[PDB]
CSV table of C-alpha atoms in Angstrom, one decimal:
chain,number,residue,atom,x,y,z
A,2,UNK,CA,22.0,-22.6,-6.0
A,3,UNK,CA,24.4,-25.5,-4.9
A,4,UNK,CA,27.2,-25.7,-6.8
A,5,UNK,CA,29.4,-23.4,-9.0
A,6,UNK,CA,28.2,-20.6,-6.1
A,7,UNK,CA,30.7,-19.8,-3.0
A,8,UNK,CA,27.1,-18.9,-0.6
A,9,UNK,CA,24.1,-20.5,-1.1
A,10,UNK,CA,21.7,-18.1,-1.7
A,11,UNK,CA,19.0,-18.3,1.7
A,12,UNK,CA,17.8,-20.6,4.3
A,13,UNK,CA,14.2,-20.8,5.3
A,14,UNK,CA,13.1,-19.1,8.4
A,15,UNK,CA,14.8,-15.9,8.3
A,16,UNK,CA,14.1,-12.3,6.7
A,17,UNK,CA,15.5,-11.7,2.6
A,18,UNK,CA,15.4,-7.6,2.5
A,19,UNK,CA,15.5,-4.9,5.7
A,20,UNK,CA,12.4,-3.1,4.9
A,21,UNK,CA,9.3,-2.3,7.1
A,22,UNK,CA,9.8,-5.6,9.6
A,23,UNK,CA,8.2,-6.3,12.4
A,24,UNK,CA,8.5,-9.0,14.9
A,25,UNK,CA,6.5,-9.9,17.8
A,26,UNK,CA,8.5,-11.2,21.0
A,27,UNK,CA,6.2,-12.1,23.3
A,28,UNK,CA,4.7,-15.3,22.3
A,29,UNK,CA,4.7,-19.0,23.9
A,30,UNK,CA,4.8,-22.5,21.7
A,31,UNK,CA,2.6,-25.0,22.0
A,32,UNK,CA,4.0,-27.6,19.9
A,33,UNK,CA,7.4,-28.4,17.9
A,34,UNK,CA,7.5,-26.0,15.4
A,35,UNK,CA,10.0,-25.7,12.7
A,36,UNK,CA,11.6,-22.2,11.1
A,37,UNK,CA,9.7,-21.2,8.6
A,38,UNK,CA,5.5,-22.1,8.3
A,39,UNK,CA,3.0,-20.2,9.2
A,40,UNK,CA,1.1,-20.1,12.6
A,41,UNK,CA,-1.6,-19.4,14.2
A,42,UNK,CA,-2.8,-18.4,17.7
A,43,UNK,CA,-4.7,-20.3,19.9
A,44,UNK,CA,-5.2,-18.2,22.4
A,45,UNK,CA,-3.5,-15.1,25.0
A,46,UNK,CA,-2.7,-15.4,28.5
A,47,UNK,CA,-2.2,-12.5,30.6
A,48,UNK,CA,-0.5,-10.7,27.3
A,49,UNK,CA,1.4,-13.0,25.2
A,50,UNK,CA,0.1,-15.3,22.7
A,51,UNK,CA,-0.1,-18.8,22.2
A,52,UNK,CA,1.1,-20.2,19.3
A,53,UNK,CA,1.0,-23.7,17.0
A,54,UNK,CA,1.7,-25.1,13.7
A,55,UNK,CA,-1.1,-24.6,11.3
A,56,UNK,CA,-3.9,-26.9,11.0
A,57,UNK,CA,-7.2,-27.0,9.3
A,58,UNK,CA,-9.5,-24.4,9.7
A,59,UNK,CA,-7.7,-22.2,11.1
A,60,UNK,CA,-5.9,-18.2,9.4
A,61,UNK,CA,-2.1,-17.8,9.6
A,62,UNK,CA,-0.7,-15.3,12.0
A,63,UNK,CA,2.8,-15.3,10.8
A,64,UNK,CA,6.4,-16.7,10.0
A,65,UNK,CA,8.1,-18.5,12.7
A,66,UNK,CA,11.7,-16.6,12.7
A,67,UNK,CA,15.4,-18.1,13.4
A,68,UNK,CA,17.3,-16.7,16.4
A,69,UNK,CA,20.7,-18.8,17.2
A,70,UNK,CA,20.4,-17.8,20.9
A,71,UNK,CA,17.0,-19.1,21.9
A,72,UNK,CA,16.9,-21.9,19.9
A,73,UNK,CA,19.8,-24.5,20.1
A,74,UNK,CA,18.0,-27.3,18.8
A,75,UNK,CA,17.4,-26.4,15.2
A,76,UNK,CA,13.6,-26.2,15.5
A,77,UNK,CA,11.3,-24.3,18.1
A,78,UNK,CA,10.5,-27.2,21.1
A,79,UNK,CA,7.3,-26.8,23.0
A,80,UNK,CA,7.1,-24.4,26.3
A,81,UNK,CA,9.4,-21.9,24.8
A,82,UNK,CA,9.2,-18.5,23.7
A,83,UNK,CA,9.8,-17.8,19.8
A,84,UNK,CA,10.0,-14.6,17.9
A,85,UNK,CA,7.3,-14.5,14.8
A,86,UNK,CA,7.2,-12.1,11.9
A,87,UNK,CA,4.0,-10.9,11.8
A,88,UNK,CA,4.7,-8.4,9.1
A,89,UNK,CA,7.9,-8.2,6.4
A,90,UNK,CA,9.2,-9.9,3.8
A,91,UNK,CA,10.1,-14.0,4.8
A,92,UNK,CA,11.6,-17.2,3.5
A,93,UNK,CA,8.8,-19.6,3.7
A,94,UNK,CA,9.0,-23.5,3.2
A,95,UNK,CA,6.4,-25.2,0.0
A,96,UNK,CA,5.6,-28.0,-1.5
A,97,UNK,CA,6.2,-26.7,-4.9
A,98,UNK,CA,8.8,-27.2,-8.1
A,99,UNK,CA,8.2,-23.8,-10.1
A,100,UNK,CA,7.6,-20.3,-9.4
A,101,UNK,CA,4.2,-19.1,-9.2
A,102,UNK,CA,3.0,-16.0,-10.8
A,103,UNK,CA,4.0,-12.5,-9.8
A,104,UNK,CA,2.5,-10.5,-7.0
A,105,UNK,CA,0.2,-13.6,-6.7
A,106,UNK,CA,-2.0,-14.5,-3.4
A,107,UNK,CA,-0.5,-17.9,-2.4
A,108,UNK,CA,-2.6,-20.5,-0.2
A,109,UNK,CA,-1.3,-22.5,3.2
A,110,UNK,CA,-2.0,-26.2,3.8
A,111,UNK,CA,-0.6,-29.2,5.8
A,112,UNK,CA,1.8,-27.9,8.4
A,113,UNK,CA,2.1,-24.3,7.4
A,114,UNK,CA,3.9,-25.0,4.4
A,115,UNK,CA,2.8,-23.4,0.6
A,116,UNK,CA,1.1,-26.0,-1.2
A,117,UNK,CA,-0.1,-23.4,-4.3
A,118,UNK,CA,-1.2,-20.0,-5.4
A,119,UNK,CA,-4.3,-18.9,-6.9
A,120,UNK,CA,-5.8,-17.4,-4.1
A,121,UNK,CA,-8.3,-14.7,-3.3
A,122,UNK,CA,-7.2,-12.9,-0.2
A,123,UNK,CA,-3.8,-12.9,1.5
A,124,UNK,CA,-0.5,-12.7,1.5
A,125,UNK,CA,1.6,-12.4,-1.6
A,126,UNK,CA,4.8,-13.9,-4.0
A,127,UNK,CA,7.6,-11.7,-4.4
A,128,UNK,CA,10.1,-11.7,-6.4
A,129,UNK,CA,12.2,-15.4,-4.9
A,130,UNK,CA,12.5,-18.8,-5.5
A,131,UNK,CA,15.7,-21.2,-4.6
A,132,UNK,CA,16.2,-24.9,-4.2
A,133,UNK,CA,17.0,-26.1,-0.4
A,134,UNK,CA,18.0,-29.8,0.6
A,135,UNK,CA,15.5,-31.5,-1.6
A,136,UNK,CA,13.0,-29.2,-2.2
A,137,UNK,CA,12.4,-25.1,-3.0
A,138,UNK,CA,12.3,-22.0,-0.6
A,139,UNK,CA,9.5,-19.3,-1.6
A,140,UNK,CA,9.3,-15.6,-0.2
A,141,UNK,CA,6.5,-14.4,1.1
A,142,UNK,CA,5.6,-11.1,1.4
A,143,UNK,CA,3.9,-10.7,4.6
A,144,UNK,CA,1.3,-7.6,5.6
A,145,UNK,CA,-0.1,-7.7,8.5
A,146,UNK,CA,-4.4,-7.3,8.9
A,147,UNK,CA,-4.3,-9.8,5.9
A,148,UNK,CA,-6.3,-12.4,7.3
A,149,UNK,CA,-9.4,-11.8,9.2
A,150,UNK,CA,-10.2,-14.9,11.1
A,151,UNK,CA,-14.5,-15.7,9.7
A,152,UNK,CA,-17.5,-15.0,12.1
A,153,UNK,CA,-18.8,-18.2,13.5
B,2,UNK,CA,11.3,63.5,-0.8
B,3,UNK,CA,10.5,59.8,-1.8
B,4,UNK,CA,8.6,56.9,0.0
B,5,UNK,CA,10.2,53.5,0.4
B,6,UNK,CA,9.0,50.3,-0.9
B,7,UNK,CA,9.5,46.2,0.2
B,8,UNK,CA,8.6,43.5,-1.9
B,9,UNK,CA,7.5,40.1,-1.2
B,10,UNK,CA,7.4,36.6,-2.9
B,11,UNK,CA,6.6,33.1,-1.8
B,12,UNK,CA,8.3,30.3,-3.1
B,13,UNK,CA,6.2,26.9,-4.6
B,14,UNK,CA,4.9,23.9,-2.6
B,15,UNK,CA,6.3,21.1,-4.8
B,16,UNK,CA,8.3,19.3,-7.4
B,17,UNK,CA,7.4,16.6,-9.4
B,18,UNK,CA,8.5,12.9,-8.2
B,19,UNK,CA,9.4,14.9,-4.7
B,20,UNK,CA,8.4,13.1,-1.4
B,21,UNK,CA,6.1,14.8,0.3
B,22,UNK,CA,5.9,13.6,3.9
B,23,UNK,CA,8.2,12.2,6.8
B,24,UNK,CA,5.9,9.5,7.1
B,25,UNK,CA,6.2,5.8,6.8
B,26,UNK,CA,7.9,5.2,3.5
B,27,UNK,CA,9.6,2.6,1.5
B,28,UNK,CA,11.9,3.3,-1.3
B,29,UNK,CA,13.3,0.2,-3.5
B,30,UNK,CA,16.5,0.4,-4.8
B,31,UNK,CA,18.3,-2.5,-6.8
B,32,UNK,CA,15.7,-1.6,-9.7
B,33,UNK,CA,16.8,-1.2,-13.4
B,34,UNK,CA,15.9,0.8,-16.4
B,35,UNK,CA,14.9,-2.7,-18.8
B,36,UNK,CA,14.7,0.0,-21.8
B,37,UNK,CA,13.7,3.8,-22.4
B,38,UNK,CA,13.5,6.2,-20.2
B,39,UNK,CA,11.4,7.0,-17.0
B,40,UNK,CA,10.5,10.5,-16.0
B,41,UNK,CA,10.4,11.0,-12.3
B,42,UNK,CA,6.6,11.3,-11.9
B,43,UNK,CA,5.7,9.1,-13.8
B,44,UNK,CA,4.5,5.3,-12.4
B,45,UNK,CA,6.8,2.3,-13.7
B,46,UNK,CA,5.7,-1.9,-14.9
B,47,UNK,CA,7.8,-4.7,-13.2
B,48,UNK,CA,8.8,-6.4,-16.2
B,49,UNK,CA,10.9,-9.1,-14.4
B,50,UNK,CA,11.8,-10.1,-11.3
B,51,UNK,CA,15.0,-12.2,-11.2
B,52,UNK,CA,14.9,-15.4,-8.9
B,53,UNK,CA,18.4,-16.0,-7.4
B,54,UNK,CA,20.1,-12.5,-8.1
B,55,UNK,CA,17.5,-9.9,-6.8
B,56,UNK,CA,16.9,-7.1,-9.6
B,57,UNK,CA,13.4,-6.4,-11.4
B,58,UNK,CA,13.7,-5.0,-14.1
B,59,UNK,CA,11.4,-1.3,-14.3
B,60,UNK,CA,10.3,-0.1,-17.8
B,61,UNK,CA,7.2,2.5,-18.8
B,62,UNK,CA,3.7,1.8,-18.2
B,63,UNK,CA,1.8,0.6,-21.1
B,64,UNK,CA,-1.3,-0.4,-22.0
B,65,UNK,CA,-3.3,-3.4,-19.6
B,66,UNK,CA,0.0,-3.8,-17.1
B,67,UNK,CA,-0.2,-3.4,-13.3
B,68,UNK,CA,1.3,-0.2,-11.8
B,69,UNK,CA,4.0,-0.9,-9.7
B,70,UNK,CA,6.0,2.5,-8.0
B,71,UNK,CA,6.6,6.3,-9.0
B,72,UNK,CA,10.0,7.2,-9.3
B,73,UNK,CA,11.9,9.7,-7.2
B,74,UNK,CA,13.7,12.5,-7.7
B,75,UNK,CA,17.7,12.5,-6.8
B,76,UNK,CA,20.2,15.0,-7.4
B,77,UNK,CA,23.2,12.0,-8.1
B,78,UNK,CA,21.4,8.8,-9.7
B,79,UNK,CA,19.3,11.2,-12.1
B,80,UNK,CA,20.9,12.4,-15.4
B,81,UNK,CA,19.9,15.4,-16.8
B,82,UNK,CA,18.3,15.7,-20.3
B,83,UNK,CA,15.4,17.5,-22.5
B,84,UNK,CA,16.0,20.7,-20.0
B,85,UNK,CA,14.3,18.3,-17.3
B,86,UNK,CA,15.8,15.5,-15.1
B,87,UNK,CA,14.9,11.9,-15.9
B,88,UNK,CA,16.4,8.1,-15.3
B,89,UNK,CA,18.3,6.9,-18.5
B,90,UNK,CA,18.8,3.6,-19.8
B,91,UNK,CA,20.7,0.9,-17.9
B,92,UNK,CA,21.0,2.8,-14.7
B,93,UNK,CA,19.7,2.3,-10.8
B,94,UNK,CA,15.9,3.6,-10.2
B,95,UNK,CA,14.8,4.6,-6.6
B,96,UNK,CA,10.9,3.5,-6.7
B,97,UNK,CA,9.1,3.9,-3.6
B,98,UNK,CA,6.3,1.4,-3.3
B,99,UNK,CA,4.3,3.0,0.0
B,100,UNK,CA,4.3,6.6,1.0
B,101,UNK,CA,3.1,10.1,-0.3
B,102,UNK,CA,4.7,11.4,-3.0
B,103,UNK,CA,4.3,14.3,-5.8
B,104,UNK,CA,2.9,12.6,-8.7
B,105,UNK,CA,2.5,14.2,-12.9
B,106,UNK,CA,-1.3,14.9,-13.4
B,107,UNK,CA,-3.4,15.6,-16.6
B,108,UNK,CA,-6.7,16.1,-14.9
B,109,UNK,CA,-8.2,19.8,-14.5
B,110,UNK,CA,-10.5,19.2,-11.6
B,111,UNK,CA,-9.3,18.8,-8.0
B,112,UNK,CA,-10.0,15.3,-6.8
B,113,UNK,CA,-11.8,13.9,-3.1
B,114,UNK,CA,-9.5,13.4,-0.2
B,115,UNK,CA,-9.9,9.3,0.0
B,116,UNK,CA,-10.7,7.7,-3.9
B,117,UNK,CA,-9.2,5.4,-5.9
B,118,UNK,CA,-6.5,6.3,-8.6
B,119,UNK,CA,-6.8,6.4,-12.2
B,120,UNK,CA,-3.5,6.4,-14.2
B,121,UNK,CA,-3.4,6.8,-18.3
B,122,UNK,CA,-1.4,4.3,-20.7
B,123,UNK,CA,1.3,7.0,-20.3
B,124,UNK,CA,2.0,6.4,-16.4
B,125,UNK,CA,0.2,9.9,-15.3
B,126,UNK,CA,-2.7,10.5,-13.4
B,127,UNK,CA,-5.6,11.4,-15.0
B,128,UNK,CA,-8.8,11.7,-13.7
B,129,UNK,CA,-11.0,9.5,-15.8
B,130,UNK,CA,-8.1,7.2,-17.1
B,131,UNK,CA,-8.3,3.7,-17.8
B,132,UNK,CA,-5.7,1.9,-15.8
B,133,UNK,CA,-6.6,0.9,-12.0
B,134,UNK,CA,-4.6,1.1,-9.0
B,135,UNK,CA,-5.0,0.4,-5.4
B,136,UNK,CA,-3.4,4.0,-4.6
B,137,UNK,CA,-6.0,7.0,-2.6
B,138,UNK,CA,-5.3,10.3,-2.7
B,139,UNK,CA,-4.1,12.4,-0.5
B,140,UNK,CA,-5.0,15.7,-0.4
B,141,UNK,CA,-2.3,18.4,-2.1
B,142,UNK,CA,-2.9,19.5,-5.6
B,143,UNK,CA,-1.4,22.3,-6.8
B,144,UNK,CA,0.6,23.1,-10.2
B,145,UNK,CA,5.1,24.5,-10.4
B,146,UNK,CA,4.4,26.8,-13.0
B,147,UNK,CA,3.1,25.3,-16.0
B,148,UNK,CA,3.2,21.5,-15.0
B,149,UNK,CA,0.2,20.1,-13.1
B,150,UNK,CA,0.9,18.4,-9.7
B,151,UNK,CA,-1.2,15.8,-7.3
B,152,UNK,CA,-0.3,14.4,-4.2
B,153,UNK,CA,-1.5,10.4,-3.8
B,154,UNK,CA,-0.7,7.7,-0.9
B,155,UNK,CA,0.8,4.6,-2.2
B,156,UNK,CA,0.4,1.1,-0.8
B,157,UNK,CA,2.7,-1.8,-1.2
B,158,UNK,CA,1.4,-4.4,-3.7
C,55,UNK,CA,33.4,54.7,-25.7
C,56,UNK,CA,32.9,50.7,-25.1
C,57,UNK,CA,35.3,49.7,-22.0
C,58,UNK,CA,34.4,52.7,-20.7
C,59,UNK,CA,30.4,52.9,-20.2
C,60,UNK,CA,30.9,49.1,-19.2
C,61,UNK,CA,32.4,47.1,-16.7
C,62,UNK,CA,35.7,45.1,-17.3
C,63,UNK,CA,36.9,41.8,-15.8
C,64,UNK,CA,40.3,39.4,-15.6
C,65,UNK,CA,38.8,35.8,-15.0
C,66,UNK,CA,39.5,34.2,-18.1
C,67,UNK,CA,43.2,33.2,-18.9
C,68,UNK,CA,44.5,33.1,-22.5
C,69,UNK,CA,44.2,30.0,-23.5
C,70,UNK,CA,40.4,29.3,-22.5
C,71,UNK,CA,37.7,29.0,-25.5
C,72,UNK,CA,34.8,29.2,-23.2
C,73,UNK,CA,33.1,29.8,-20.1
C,74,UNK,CA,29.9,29.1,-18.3
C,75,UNK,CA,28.0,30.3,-15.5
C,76,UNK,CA,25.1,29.3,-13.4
C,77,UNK,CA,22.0,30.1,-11.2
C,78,UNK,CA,19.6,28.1,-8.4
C,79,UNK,CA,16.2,28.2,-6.9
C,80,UNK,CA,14.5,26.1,-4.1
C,81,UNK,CA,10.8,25.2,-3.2
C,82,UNK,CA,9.2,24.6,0.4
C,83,UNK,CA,6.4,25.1,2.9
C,84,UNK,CA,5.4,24.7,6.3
C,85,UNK,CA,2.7,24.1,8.4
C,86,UNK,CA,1.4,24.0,12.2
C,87,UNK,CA,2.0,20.6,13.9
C,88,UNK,CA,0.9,18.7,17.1
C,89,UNK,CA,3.3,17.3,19.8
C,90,UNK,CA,3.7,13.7,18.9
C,91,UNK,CA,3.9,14.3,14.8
C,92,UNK,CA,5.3,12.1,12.2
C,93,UNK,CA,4.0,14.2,9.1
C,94,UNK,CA,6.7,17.3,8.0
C,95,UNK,CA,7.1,18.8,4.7
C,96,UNK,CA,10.3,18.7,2.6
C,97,UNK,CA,12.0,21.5,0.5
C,98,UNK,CA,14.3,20.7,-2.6
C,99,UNK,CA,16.3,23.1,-5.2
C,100,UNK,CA,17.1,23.4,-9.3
C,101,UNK,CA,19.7,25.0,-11.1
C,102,UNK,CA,20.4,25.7,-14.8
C,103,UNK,CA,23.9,27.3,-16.9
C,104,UNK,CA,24.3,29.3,-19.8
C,105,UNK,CA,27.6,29.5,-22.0
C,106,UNK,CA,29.9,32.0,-24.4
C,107,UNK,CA,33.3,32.2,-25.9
D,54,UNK,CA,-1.8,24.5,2.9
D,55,UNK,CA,-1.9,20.8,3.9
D,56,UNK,CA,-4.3,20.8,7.4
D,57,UNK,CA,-6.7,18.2,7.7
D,58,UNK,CA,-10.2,19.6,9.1
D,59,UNK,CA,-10.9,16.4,11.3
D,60,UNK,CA,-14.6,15.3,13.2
D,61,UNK,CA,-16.0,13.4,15.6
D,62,UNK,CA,-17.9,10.2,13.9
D,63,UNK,CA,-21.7,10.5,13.0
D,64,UNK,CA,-23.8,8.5,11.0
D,65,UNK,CA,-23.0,6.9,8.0
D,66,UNK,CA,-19.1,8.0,7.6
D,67,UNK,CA,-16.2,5.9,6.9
D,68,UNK,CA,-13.6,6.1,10.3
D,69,UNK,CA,-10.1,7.6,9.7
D,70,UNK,CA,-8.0,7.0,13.1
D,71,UNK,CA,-8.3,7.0,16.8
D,72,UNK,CA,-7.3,9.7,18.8
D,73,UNK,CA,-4.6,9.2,21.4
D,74,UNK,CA,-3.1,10.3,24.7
D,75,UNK,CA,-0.8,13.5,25.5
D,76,UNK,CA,-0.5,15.5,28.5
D,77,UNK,CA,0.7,19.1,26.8
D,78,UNK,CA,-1.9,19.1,24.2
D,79,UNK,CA,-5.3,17.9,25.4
D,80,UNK,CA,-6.9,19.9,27.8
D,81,UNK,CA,-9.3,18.5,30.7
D,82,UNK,CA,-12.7,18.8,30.7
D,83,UNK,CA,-15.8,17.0,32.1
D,84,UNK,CA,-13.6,15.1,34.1
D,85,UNK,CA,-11.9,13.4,31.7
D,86,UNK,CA,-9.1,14.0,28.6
D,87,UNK,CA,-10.6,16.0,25.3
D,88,UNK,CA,-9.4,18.3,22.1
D,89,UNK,CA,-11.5,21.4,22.1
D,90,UNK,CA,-12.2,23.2,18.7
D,91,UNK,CA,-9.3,25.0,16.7
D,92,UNK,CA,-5.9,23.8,17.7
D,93,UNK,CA,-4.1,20.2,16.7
D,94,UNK,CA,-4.8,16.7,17.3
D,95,UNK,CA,-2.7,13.6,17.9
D,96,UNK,CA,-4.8,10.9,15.3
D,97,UNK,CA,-2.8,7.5,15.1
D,98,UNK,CA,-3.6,5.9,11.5
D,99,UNK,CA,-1.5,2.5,12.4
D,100,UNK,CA,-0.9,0.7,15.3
D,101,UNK,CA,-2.3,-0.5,18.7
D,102,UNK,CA,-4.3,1.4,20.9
D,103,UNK,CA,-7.1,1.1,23.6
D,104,UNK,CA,-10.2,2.2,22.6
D,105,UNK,CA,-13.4,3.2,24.7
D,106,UNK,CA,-16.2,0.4,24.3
């Protein structure tokens, strides 16, 4: 990336490949959330769902998504609706310097954002990795029923 | 005097590599041939997957690597050779990584309608072969002449 | 008695050292389907050529 | 030929989909919606849908 390129190559928070997407549209936010990171839901009133940033304890939805009509603030602000991908193929934020292995589960921590691999059950790595700001961009390969939120 | 006759014939169900439903599918292009060739029922190994550019690399299954996508038949990409039609060297491969497609089988035995898949170090199914897949079966298993055919349901990895 | 117990043709010109002709097929089936149905078969072809001089 | 010779669930069997609404194919009976024997059914392998509970 960066120089010796005319584009860069992505920015985080919006889809890499047009194949089998979906995105859900009726959803409220709770908090300031920022493209990119997963979330997870809280809780649906009278249809649509509520959403926040991850925290502990809790199994990621989906991808928050970047629309340049909703949103002219550069993040999502709180009391506003926001489009998230709950299944397709996303640029994610991490915490990471080097690519993890192929078609590997990764793992969520801090505020949504990849903080390794080496998991047992989840999503998965595809084939992506580019440097943003200061800091990477993984892709994230997301499948929907991936999750299943533990019995109490 | 004479009494007429009228013949009939009935054509064959498949081909191999050949989707096999309208169903919900997902064919990959931007793949390429690393080296060899790859027939078009036959399952392929992601050998890399470049970072900033895009392409992975597709080669032949060998022993102990992860299936990845069966090949599919084109009448433009595909180059015709050995009296059959397979993917050269150096050249595009369409791979679909969910759907139903015809697959290349060795096995004799028709198999159960939801079951894992078993492919062989050569990249065709075989019913008691040693590589693993997450794959079911479908259903369809017939035979175009003297080549063996199976029908499987892929999901994406 | 050759060109006359067998059938004679014009389509090559002079100067042409060979020629080549071909033939097709095609596979396919059917089946009964429902009202809201996203499951249909597909049909393909083949072909082959053979050559002289 | 391709058909799949579906069921109603019974004990110890693994589920395959959920049955769905049409007004052409499903004919009325007991007062309420149903697929009789013989004929095609609409089952919906992905998605959302309101089952009975």
């Amino acid at each position: 990336a960066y120089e010796n390129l005319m584009l860069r190559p992505a920015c985080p928070g919006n889809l890499s490949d047009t194949s089998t997407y979906n995105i859900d549209g009726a959803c409220v936010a709770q908090g300031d959330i920022e493209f990119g990171s997963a979330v997870q839901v809280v809780g649906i009133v009278d249809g649509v769902k509520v959403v926040t940033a991850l925290s502990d304890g809790g199994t990621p939805y989906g991808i928050a998504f970047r629309s340049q009509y909703e949103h002219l603030s550069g993040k999502i602000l709180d009391g506003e609706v926001c489009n998230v991908v709950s299944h397709g193929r996303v640029w994610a934020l991490t915490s990471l310097d080097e690519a993890p292995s192929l078609f590997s589960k990764l793992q969520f921590g801090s505020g949504g954002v990849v903080t390794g691999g080496s998991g047992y059950a989840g999503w998965t790595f595809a084939g992506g990795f580019v440097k943003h700001e200061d800091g990477y961009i993984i892709e994230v390969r997301v499948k929907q029923n991936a999750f299943i939120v533990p019995p109490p | 005097a004479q009494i007429n006759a009228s013949y009939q014939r009935d054509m064959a169900i498949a081909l191999p590599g050949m989707v096999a439903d309208t169903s919900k599918y997902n064919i990959d292009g931007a793949c390429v041939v690393n080296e060899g060739d790859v027939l078009v029922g036959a399952a392929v190994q992601v050998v890399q997957a470049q970072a900033v550019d895009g392409h992975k690399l597709v080669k032949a299954l060998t022993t102990g690597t992860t299936p990845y996508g069966v090949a599919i038949r084109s009448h433009w990409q595909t180059v015709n050779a050995q009296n059959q039609m397979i993917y050269e060297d150096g050249g595009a491969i369409n791979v679909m990584t969910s759907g139903r497609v015809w697959m290349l089988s060795k096995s004799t035995e028709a198999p159960t309608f939801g079951s894992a898949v078993k492919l062989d170090v050569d990249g065709q199914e075989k019913s008691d072969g040693t590589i693993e897949t997450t794959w079911t079966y479908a259903g369809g298993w017939t035979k175009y002449k003297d080549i063996q055919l199976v029908e499987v349901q892929l999901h994406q990895l | 008695s050759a060109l006359r117990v067998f059938p004679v043709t014009t389509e090559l010109s002079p100067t042409d050292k060979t020629f080549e002709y071909m033939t097709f097929d095609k596979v396919g089936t059917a089946q009964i389907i429902a009202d809201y149905t996203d499951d249909l078969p597909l049909v393909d072809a083949l072909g082959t050529s053979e050559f002289g001089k």
